[PDB]
Design a protein around this ligand. Structure first.
Ligand SMILES: Nc1ncnc2c1ncn2[C@@H]1O[C@H](COP(=O)(O)OP(=O)(O)NP(=O)(O)O)[C@@H](O)[C@H]1O
Ligand SMILES: [Mg+2]
Length: 380
């Protein structure tokens, strides 16, 4: 009766969809955004989630949590966890070999499991859907990277249950993307599908073989630390140098200034996917000095040229592992907000000798879209 929802719980942005009245609808949140930051923040008086949390990140770096997906289902001693901890502004502690994020909340020290943090993000996605539908949601399909192990899948499901959702199924993100494009339905025989997923924090390449609605992972490649945030970083360093040239001041030490500049760069970056230039206007960036400038799409491409180019190596590697030539791939599917960058689409298309790309569904919404279709199917 009530519709089930599909939820892409991303490392950096999450998205929710619902199949209703013959179509999938990706649901906009309170601020009108089709995707919501996977951020949670704790203050002296409240818990903020999504846009409201990410928006005050510069003001409260120690108690604003993100990247919970990097910790979920892992052991404190996991080398990945130990490595990732070096770069986060928030504290992570060991609780029975399970990591917990420790923060200050309402004047006290409190710690939360990764699934608790993600349950908050999922709760927000559930509320977003309920606001649109006009009624409560209690069924959902949630997605995870194809390489997640049983523990990571269990903890992701636990996050959903904590959020008040009955988790119909946990399915792989690349499978969800294929379902969004109706690729789960094939003619006689098997089809080889390549999912090129470049998001905010990670880059995943997956080669799937689909046969009669059955999905098999033939190969996976990528880089868990390559994504849109790295492109934002190249822009930040470029503007830090511009500010030095213009004002003979180095703002790299001011945390607030660098965070505000990063936020502005992410917006300018998005604009450069549709327009050829973008302007950045930051009032009182550093020592009361305003910073108003512009940057062109070509300059952005130059600043990230090596990073963009590097995305084709995992594609080559995945093909090698799957024992397939480029011509044997039947469909190319774009996933992740970073694949909206024209240069990235050109590199992939050129690498595949001119093949058209499946890109009619916003890339950062494709996983949630498929998850919603799967959820509707499962509800019968
Ligand atoms: N129009 C755009 N042009 C370029 N980049 C964009 C655009 N829209 C969103 N992005 C970036 O896409 C990234 C988010 O991708 P998205 O797929 O929504 O996140 P995700 O699912 O969490 N992926 P991941 O971080 O790897 O788990 C961020 O770096 C956004 O800044
Ligand atoms: Mg996402």
């Amino acid at each position: 009766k009530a519709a089930a929802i599909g939820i892409d719980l991303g490392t950096t942005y999450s998205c929710v969809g619902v199949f209703q009245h013959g179509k999938v609808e990706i649901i906009a949140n309170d601020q009108g955004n089709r995707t919501t930051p996977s951020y949670v923040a704790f203050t002296d008086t409240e818990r903020l989630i999504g846009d409201a949390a990410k928006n005050q990140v510069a003001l409260n770096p120690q108690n604003t949590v993100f990247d919970a997906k990097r910790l979920i289902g892992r052991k404190f001693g996991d080398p990945v966890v130990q490595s990732d901890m070096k770069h986060w502004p928030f504290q992570v502690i060991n609780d029975g070999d399970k990591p917990k994020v420790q923060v200050s909340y309402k004047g006290e020290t409190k710690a939360f499991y990764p699934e608790e943090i993600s349950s908050m993000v999922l709760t927000k996605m559930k509320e977003i859907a309920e606001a649109y539908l006009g009624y409560p949601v209690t069924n959902a399909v949630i997605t995870v990277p194809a390489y997640f192990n049983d523990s990571q899948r269990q903890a992701t499901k636990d996050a959903g249950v904590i959020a008040g959702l009955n988790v119909l199924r946990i399915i792989n993100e690349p499978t969800a993307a294929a379902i969004a494009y109706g690729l789960d339905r094939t003619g006689k025989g098997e089809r080889n599908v390549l999912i090129f997923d470049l998001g905010g924090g990670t880059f995943d390449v997956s080669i799937l073989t689909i046969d009669d609605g059955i999905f098999e992972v033939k190969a996976t490649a990528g880089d868990t630390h390559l994504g849109g945030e790295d492109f934002d970083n190249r822009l930040v360093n470029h503007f830090v140098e511009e500010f030095k040239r213009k004002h003979k001041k180095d703002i790299s030490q001011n945390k607030r200034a660098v965070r505000r500049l990063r936020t502005a760069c992410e917006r300018a970056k998005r604009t450069l996917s549709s327009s050829t230039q973008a302007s950045l206007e930051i009032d009182s960036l550093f020592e009361g000095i305003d910073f108003y400038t512009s940057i062109t799409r070509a300059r952005f491409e130059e600043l990230c040229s090596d990073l963009f180019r590097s995305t084709l190596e995992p594609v080559e590697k995945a093909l090698r592992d799957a024992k397939l030539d480029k011509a044997q791939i039947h469909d190319l599917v774009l996933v992740g907000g970073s694949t909206r960058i024209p240069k990235v689409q050109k590199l992939l298309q050129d690498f595949f000798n001119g093949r058209d790309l499946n890109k009619s569904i916003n890339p950062d919404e494709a996983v949630a879209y498929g998850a919603a279709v799967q959820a509707a199917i499962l509800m019968g």
